Design a protein around this ligand. Structure first.
Ligand code: NAG
Ligand code: NAG
Lengths: 141, 145
């Protein structure tokens, strides 16, 4: 019954967490790259993404063989709300092998207000920083 | 002007933002005594005592300026209806957040009715320090796609 664990205990962030509950059971996926280097990014809200990555909230899957690399874990979550957007952050991903000071990967998902959908249009923006975006009326105010 | 921490993509993005270079943005948050004024500029000096600052925090009680981020260390990304501008290399925290260098993150949302407006931090000095993250927002049709 594990959900998001806030990095630190902002109640403003806990309320934000309850506001996104409607997305907890949805699964977001997007595939970029081209054969044979196609990678599938699967993202979940406060639930585990991927098939072999316990605690991962967003994983990168090599389409060729299904090898999973954790980008972020929902047990190290941060969440902020702007005028018409919500920023979700998952820390504690797998460390880089020979890049970025070999630091733990991290996922940043920019959820934009879209009054015409509860959830949709998830995709990576630019892949020491993994940026993604998606639309949701939940990020509307 | 801005110095990328790089990318042709961010370079085009920097030029796409030129229309905002000579404007200055300010927003004051929190109430007496501990009120703070945040001054933000695009690829241009924002501080009065802080050289190379892209975004500064001014303690209103005494005028102490803190560099939140420098434009000589810029990063820029564009989403569907937003643009994320990042200024790293701000002054280090004194007794918070591992005493690491501050950085400013500004979320520019698409707004097809203003070239630029509604600049403000997403939280107050207090909350921002607690979260070890200085996040700001503003509107601009330049962030529209
Ligand atoms: C998150 O969960 C992972 C499980 O592998 C653990 O290693 C890590 O310490 C946890 N992070 C925190 C700070 O809770
Ligand atoms: C940015 O400028 C400051 C001087 O104010 C300097 O300390 C820092 O090393 C510079 N960073 C880069 C990108 O060279």
């Amino acid at each position: 019954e594990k959900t998001c664990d806030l990095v630190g205990e902002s109640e403003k962030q806990l309320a934000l967490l309850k506001r996104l509950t409607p997305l907890f059971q949805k699964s977001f996926e997007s595939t970029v790259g081209q054969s044979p280097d196609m990678y599938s990014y699967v993202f979940r809200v406060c639930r585990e993404a991927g098939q072999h990555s316990s605690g991962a909230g967003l994983v990168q899957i090599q389409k060729s063989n299904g090898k999973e690399t954790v980008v972020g874990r929902f047990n190290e979550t941060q969440i902020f709300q702007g005028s018409n957007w919500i920023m979700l952050i998952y820390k504690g991903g797998d460390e880089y092998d020979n890049h970025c000071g070999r630091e733990q990967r991290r996922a940043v998902v920019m959820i934009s207000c879209n009054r015409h959908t509860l959830a949709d249009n998830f995709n990576p923006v630019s892949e020491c920083f993994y940026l993604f975006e998606m639309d949701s009326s939940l990020a509307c105010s």
